[PDB]
Amino acid sequence: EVDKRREINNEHPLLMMPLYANGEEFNQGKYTFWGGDTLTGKWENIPDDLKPYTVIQLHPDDLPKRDGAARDFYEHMLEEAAKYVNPKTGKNEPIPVILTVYTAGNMPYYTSAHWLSTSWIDKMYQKYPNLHGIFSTASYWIWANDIENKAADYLKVSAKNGGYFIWAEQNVGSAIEKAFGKNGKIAFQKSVDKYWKNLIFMFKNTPAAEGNDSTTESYMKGLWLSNHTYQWGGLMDTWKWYETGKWKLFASGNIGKSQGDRQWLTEPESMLGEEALGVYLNGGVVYNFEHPAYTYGVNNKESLLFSEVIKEFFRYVIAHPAPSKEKVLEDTKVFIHGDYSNKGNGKFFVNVNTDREQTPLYMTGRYNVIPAIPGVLKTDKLKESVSSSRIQIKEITSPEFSSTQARKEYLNKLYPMNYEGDIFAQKLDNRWFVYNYKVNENVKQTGKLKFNSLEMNVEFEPHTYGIFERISNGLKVNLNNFRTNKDSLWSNAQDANQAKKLPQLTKKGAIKWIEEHYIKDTQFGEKRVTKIVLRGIDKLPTIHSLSGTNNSYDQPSLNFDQKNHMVTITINSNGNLEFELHFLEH
């Protein structure tokens, strides 16, 4: 083992910061990114507390599809990254970089990344200590004949240099299963046997119409727990709204894949946090997002989605490290071995812990995420772990997995019901994590959670998550329901058919819209009500350390009922919010 260039784990999570090459301007002799971010400007704008946990991910996007283009662009930016001087201290502080080296099967008709040899990658690793890793993303839909052989080389050249190979992929057409050798292409399987400590595997939830969210995330978690990857994460993509044909929030009708650039703007901001919770709560530590202009920002400025949701969520996972592999293994009661492709893919979990075929969310935390590995792999390194002796390792073909009903009946015996109400809730140590799991339906949800004898009832509108921590002097609360009004994008269309026929916003038009109507002159959503009821309380609680998105919340209202020893907390907000309540139990 060569010394790793960086740590990636629960205590050192990783936020990837994508910068997409502008190929049109490249043809004009410029070195720029779509959305107007600069490498240096973006890095400088990253908050100093986040800098140790964030890496700039270069992507070749629409660079010319010919030899030399991607190399020329990448060498230019690695030079900029390497020579960076911190203006406050005057010291050279090389900016850490990940290069996107593989995507779209590296077909010469799809990407300039085709003309990046492993020899060149090796050269850049040796030249640039700030090159921390290389990234393969989104070939599920174009599974090239030598993809597994090429992934083996990427992992090996990374290991050789102490860098990470990062692969984001979704289980469309058995991609994850094939990667590990299902169809007999075993090169990457063998590479992983030697070099897994340098591999990061991530889901990529983009192809949402295929509904592989639950099954891909289950693999990512199981690969990690069984030592087939060093850590895991997910790329969470607002393009899912396009893939599934949604339009105006809560509107009826499906428009199909007809308004791409309006559609990738429409996913509620807070829903990205709901998606990211599934990574964190299950020991994942790597985060990435598309579309970058919405999820991160433009012109070296943070979008409100980034500042109010993603940034604050990432700060949370740094302050409260995700459960360790040891911890997750200890809590795991069932571990699946086999191919989800043989068992209905995402349908496997529908009405088990997901409410529908096409969703990135869960409807219960009762089983958290059941971890799995493809049938091609062995559970040897899993059983070698000391923390894994209480786990039932089960073939996916077992009768307990044969139907929806059999799955719940089997899992219910091993995972006890630990809350009430039709809402998503999961508990870690002294913390309840809660969200409303509705995607595009305006329906409130309620739950009853307990901290021993203390009862907490909550009422959540859609696109609202909360983290409730029992501390010695009371309850720490994090709430996020940030959701701006996107209706303007869908102006002039009263129904789905009409929305289909709107003029294309276009990629450049959407970037412009962000600049003109999201970065500034934002159409904020209306404040909306969250209720929290605590039963078993001695006196009216006091509120402390209240803060949140500027101008986004009314002062919380507390109504204490001495006779019933209970308080009703009414919050009216639209944003990120945190406070503590101080009280004693009765």
Ligand X SMILES: CC(=O)N[C@@H]1[C@@H](O)[C@H](O[C@@H]2O[C@H](CO)[C@H](O)[C@H](O[C@H]3O[C@H](CO)[C@H](O)[C@H](O)[C@H]3NC(C)=O)[C@H]2O[C@@H]2O[C@@H](C)[C@@H](O)[C@@H](O)[C@@H]2O)[C@@H](CO)O[C@H]1O
Could you list the residues that contact ligand X (CB under 6 A)? Answer: 20, 34, 59, 61-62, 103-104, 110, 137-138, 141, 206-207, 239, 242-243, 290-292, 507
Nearer to ligand X, 272 or 449 (CB): 272
Contact partners, residue 284, CB within 8 Å, separation at least 6: 220, 221, 224, 231, 232, 233, 234, 278, 322
Shortest distance (Å) from residue 59 CB to ligand X? 6
248 within 8 A of 266, measured Cβ to Cβ: yes
Shortest distance (Å) from residue 58 CB to ligand X? 11
Shortest distance (Å) from residue 33 CB to ligand X? 10
Calpha distance 98→82 (Å, rounded): 13
Nearer to ligand X, 238 or 353 (CB): 238
Nearer to ligand X, 240 or 394 (CB): 240
Listed residue (16, 11, 388, 1) closest to 200, CA to CA? 16
Alpha-carbon torsion (240, 287, 340, 100), positive or negative: positive
Nearer to ligand X, 233 or 536 (CB): 233
Nearer to ligand X, 136 or 530 (CB): 136
Give residue 264's identity as a one-letter amino acid code.
W
Nearer to ligand X, 34 or 230 (CB): 34
Shortest distance (Å) from residue 207 CB to ligand X? 4
Take residue 131 and report the two structure tokens written for it: 């090159």
Nearer to ligand X, 110 or 560 (CB): 110
Take residue 540 and report the two structure tokens written for it: 């009216």
Shortest distance (Å) from residue 332 CB to ligand X? 31
User: 488, exposed or middle or buried, with CB in 10 Å at 0-12, 13-18, 19+?
Assistant: exposed
60 within 8 A of 332, measured Cβ to Cβ: no
Shortest distance (Å) from residue 73 CB to ligand X? 14
Q: In the beta sheet, which residues pair with residue 18?
A: 57
Shortest distance (Å) from residue 201 CB to ligand X? 16
Listed residue (368, 541, 367, 545) closest to 454, CA to CA? 541
**H or E element, residue 580:** strand 576-582
Calpha distance 261→355 (Å, rounded): 27
Nearer to ligand X, 242 or 419 (CB): 242
Q: What is the DSSP letter of 462?
A: S
Shortest distance (Å) from residue 191 CB to ligand X? 22
Nearer to ligand X, 263 or 368 (CB): 263
Per DSSP, the three-state class of 463 is: coil
Q: What is the DSSP letter of 157?
A: H
Calpha distance 457→435 (Å, rounded): 13
Shortest distance (Å) from residue 475 CB to ligand X? 39
Shortest distance (Å) from residue 295 CB to ligand X? 9
Shortest distance (Å) from residue 115 CB to ligand X? 15
Shortest distance (Å) from residue 260 CB to ligand X? 6
Calpha distance 31→38 (Å, rounded): 9
Alpha-carbon torsion (22, 23, 28, 30), positive or negative: positive
Nearer to ligand X, 23 or 371 (CB): 23
Calpha distance 79→356 (Å, rounded): 47
Nearer to ligand X, 239 or 468 (CB): 239
Shortest distance (Å) from residue 289 CB to ligand X? 9
Contact partners, residue 554, CB within 8 Å, separation at least 6: 527, 571, 572, 573
Take residue 555 and report the two structure tokens written for it: 């002062």
Nearer to ligand X, 237 or 355 (CB): 237
Nearer to ligand X, 172 or 499 (CB): 172
Torsion-angle region of 101 (φ positive above 0: left; ψ -120 to 50: alpha; else: beta): alpha
Nearer to ligand X, 62 or 400 (CB): 62
Angle, helix 269-280 to helix 311-319, in steps of 10 degrees: 20
Calpha distance 353→370 (Å, rounded): 10
* 209-225 exposure pattern, b = at least 16 Cβ within 10 A, e = fewer: bbbbbbbbbbbbbbbbb
Calpha distance 514→136 (Å, rounded): 28
Shortest distance (Å) from residue 365 CB to ligand X? 28
Take residue 441 and report the two structure tokens written for it: 């339906």
